[PDB]
Amino acid sequence: LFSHLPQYSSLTQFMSIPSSVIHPAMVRLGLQYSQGLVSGSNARCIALLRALQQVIQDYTTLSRDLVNKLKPYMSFLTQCRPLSASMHNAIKFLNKEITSVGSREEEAKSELRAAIDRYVQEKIVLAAQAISRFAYQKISNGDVILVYGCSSLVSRILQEAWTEGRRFRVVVVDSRPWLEGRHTLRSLVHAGVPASYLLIPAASYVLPEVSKVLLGAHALLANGSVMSRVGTAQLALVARAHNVPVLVCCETYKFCERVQTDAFVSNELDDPDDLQCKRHVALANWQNHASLRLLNLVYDVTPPELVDLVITELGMIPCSSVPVVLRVKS
Amino acid sequence: LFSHLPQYSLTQFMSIPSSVIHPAMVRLGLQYSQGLVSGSNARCIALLRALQQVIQDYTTLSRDLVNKLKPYMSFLTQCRPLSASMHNAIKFLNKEITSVGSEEAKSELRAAIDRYVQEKIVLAAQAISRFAYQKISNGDVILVYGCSSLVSRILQEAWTEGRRFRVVVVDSRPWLEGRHTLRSLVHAGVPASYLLIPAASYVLPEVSKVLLGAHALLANGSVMSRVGTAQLALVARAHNVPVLVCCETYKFCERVQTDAFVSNELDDPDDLQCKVALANWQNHASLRLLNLVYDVTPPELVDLVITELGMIPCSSVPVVLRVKS
Amino acid sequence: MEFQAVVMAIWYPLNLLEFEEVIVIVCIADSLRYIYPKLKTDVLVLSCDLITDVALHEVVDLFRAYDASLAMLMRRDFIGVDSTGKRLLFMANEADLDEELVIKGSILQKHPRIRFHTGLVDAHLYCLKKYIVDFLMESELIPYLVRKQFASSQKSLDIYSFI
Amino acid sequence: PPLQAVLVADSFDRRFFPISKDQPRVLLPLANVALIDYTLEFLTATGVQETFVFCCWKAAQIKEHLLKSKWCRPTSLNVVRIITSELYRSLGDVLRDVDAKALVRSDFLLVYGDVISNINITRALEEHRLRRKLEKNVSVMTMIFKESSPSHPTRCHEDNVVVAVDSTTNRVLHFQKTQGLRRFAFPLSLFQVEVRYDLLDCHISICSPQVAQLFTDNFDYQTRDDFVRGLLVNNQIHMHVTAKEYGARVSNLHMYSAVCADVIRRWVYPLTPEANFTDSTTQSCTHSRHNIYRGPEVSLGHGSILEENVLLGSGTVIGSNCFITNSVIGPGCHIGDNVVLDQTYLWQGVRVAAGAQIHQSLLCDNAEVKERVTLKPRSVLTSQVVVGPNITLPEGSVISLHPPDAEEDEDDGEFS
Amino acid sequence: SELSERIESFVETLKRGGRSSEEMARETLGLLRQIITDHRWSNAGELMELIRREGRRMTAAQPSETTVGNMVRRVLKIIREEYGRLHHYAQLQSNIIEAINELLVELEGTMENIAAQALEHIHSNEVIMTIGFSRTVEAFLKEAARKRKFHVIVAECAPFCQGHEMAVNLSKAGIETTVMTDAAIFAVMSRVNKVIIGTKTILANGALRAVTGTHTLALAAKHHSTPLIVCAPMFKLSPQFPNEEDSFHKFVAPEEVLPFTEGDILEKVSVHCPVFDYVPPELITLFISNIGGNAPSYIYRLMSELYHPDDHVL
């Protein structure tokens, strides 16, 4: 009964083959979103926000025109894949930046697309290498770290921490159907750090040997709850039950002023056909059974009591300062 | 909702010199329906007295008496849903009738009710009183709830055997039943205090132990009793005061139940409106008035069960259910 | 103008575009080099003949999703497609090789399952990216671009095919 | 019909040349049980009832070990029928010695003799019979390949092969070993068709008795590779590709290390060391955490660290402050203090004295090493060898009691 | 003999893993009935040594399959209680047989007596969430589905996706089912009203060894205070406590988790794939047995009237 959340199966057949109302860059990006060639919460924001640099210099006139011109683009984008808060706050900053400037057209078009690289630098690039300085001192010299799935920041940590001579041992917990903990496993064995891979139902057998649980956040809600990949909340709960400290590495811009008290609000449904096992397969042609429904969540909310740290670009905050960094910023 | 459990507000159809149901059983059922007899022990005593009246009027035996008095218990299940004390009483009576082999068996049966009431409802009450005398010390204050014929007996005999304690009587709407405790305490000279369930968290700071009564102890240790008991025991644990429930052995039902939803009689909802803004509640289609009679507290909220066999930790009530059967 | 359809030198091509201009509305293999002063923005070279109203939406989406360097439509020349059924790996139009379809070991280590199709009809619906027509200035390119991967007038280029 | 098998218990190469000289190849313990035990247990698990065992080189050791094994007792549902003959020189005269005795009558199942697998040949065998009877005795073999990936430790470069198959019915149209080659020459005219490199060879051919006829009339064949190459220049060979079940053949000692590390890590799950599939009393184990197996009465030292993937035999006293890991230590041996054992393989009975750092290696049975010895990767120590108290053997040094075969002698380097 | 060959056939089937748990117990009873008939034995002592030895080899064959060990211990208790009431006894060989037959009709009615208590624990408009595929729980959910109407969420167990065939089995019977991904157990826990699971083994302290997701399930159920009902009969009741000396985990091939086609990283990555997961008894609410619905804290008593304390260790 996740009825209020859309469930999606390509929205490219009805649209005009040259430059339509939506931009070439925006249809290219939305098609990449829907097919699944960009999956990270960070990588979707860069992918949006430098395909959106392509929108600005192609646009010719500036504020009131561009603000309502950009809205069909992100309407199409949230039709392709629902926008996460890394994308949402990016668009909010973009609209504030467009409405801030006013009164030459060429100078404004150059300054917008240069202050968008400035956004990536001082909030996704310089942030992620300031998360790693704070998490390097929290990673001990002989401990075991449990990560979950692919995260661009959790894998930047404990690979920039290993190359500073720390010699931990990562354990990679993964879940179906994304199986994206392989992508954080291939790129972590290449760094040379010892690894271990196991699925999330065995997150309670491997958790006794684990010293800390390092996770990534797709959004930090304004009550301190952590919205991220589905098994994160389950993982943090079992981490608390095995009393291992659990850490969340999140940048500041992923802080949303939206508060959720459960795990059934804005938790997008992706393709239920991903749940088909291809074992032989028994769930294939699941539409033939009327009573049978398939639930494919992509996001999940862990409460702030289940998580100890939040490593942010500005200090290490105890997850109840999440409403506070939302204040001292902006 | 509460669809499986029955809603009731029944003697109009039966003839005045009734032949379908026995006269005593009609009186008993209508006293249950109106509310003249309340409390699990009082209902069991009244049921067994009415069954003694039925057996002494029986003229012919083992199969015949059982299938004759099964419609009587159908009538009583219609009039007011049987609590587990009544259920075990009827089970014992049917076992007694089936045990009687091939006139004189009516006197031997009728005394077995007297040997049932004495050493399982009266002597058991005295034994529970002796055991709970130990747990009542001088100067402590005891929070009781509602009216129990055993809790008030324990308090009264603990007072008359020399203790100097104080009682807080917590009561609930719509029965307002702890007044029948409260007055019965004041006649005994016990210091008393009276307040409703919402104020329980106000007086659980001062309370030393919560002494409740049980209408049935189930096969996992859950205590099925009056509807405020589980909530009261939860607030009692949140104020870390010990919770004692005083139950005889014969109320132990082998039925098991987790949540307070499976077997919970509903009294008529018309009791709920207080002096009014709710008198016309039938005409409001969306509005439904709900009052449960029983709920179950889990065995982790109960620190102690006092029983005529002894004091047991509420996780070993299946032990007693084993050793008595 | 994301794309610019180029028609070689015909109502079936000109109205397969349901686009708004052709380079057959101004009429002016090597003809794309002679149509070079048109704005080099992701040319879509069509065919003079043997085009039968296949939907572009499945072919162009192999150029707007995967960011292919080149994208063809097919419906003596041996093609080796990847296991996903949409990636060209080994195109050999020359059947006059000496009875030996030699394959580089590097593609077989990178792409283990190469599915070979025998003589697929080439619809000549080339979705060249805008630098390939420039790279020719500094078939003829379809079996060269598949060899140029694993020439650089942009990364490693990638070429995807629809069947 | 009943299912048979042919098990060529003489490997007809010299890949283990300093080791095959004294011990036959299918007796040398993989995970403390011999290599012929994994193939025999695989054959028994598949459903084979009439295994034949062909021994030529060191047949006395093979037969003696077989009679004191699980499959020569009358309990076993897989008779062994050992055939000792010194006249063999290849797989060819072995498999054409079948028609000299007419041993098989239906489609048998030729494993090579040191196959290590948990393959279930019931889908493959039923497919082979189905396309055997339907196209009128056309197919003669069903090659069994495991769907590997070409960059795997189990895919060693000698045994690496490439195929070209019909892919609508799995039919081997071309097959060649890519021993030394950079570009693969696939001949034409086999199209009028997938090309696969992700196939581990696995050597579990299901060849029908016509193959024994095809080896018979053409004497020139010597091995299965020769037969598959020499038929595809002329009948049929099909295949079946497995994906969920392990299969490998320990041809060379690189393959030995890869398959021994795969068995310890439970990739061959019904044949893990703690399962004790050979039901001997001296090879019981307790699978602890991190794939650490310790046999009965092992008596681990104080402060010694077993990191992961360790197998310990019965009677395997370990010293103090050791860092043994990723290794197999064997039924009863003495390991001293402060040693380091990384990716090593130690057979039944060794003397590792004190502080000796042994990295990737193979110490055979009754080996001896003294104090402060620093064996480097890929070093092989054959039976009864001793290494003195100051040696640091170079990477890739074989040491045996036979100086012509090895690169050293009964003591440390540069001495006799 | 036929019997001996059938004994090692059973042992090797146990080792390789080639059936449901009730069929496991029924075959164990048939085998032990054959053992006590066809072997020659003078008195009960030699037969108890024989049954103990064969139970030791069947238990050491697959130590994580404890239904066979439980039924060996039940037969041992039957032997020492049908010899106690006769205290070489001639009719003893018959007497045990009858008790074994009375055990075999205690079996084949275990699933019906558990399913009879379905309506007492499942209500209309309920949402139930299960994990594996256990025949006991599907009969429980298909006896409550005859009268009432409810929702069932079958969270698949990730390595062997076996909740798929459970939710196919339940959707054929008209229960509106949802298949999950096993990562969403904490997510959909807020909605779920009861959790009904099955076990491989109920250990002697009320704890249970079950399918690998059940502890991660029980922690969520305890977090949201959802009652965790456990439907499991009395052959799944093993008298072993969760000691560290005996290993209760079973580990299968890592191909179930990380496939062999990954390649070179498989030489560095340590993949494990356990199939069983310890659930401590304080996360359990009830055990719906074939004899009732008693609490975990009663399980020790069920040990004392099923297995003799000399038969715990074999």
Numbering used by the authors:
A (entry chain E): 179 to 187, 191 to 242, 248 to 289, 292 to 467, 470 to 520
B (entry chain F): 179 to 187, 192 to 242, 248 to 289, 294 to 466, 471 to 520
C (entry chain K): 1 to 9, 36 to 44, 48 to 53, 75 to 78, 87 to 133, 155 to 217, 226 to 237, 240 to 243, ...
D (entry chain I): 41 to 232, 238 to 279, 285 to 466
E (entry chain D): 9 to 26, 29 to 97, 125 to 351
Manuscript text:
Eukaryotic translation initiation factor 2B (eIF2B) is the decameric guanine nucleotide exchange factor (GEF) for the GTPase eukaryotic translation initiation factor 2 (eIF2). Upon delivery of the initiator Met-tRNAi to the site of translation initiation, bound GTP is hydrolyzed and eIF2 is released from the scanning ribosome. eIF2B catalyzes GDP-GTP exchange on eIF2, enabling rebinding of Met-tRNAi to allow for a new cycle of mRNA translation initiation.
Motivated by our biochemical evidence that sugar phosphates are activators of eIF2B, we determined a 2.9 Å cryo-EM structure of eIF2B bound to F6P, the highest affinity identified ligand. The eIF2B-F6P complex shares the same overall architecture as previously reported eIF2B structures. This pocket is on the opposite face of the eIF2B holoenzyme from the previously described ISRIB binding pocket that sits at the symmetric eIF2Bβ/δ interface. Protein-ligand interactions in the F6P pocket are mediated by both the sugar and phosphate moieties. The 1′ position of F6P is exposed to solvent, suggesting a way by which bulkier ribonucleotides (e.g. UMP and AMP) could be accommodated in this site. Notably, we did not observe electron density for any ligands within the eIF2Bβ or eIF2Bδ metabolite pockets, despite their homology to eIF2Bα. The holoenzyme structures in the absence and presence of F6P are also strikingly similar, with global r.m.s.d. = 1.6 Å. The most prominent difference is a uniform shift in the position of both eIF2Bε subunits, wherein the β-sheet rich domain moves inwards towards the cognate eIF2Bα subunit by ~1.5–2 Å.
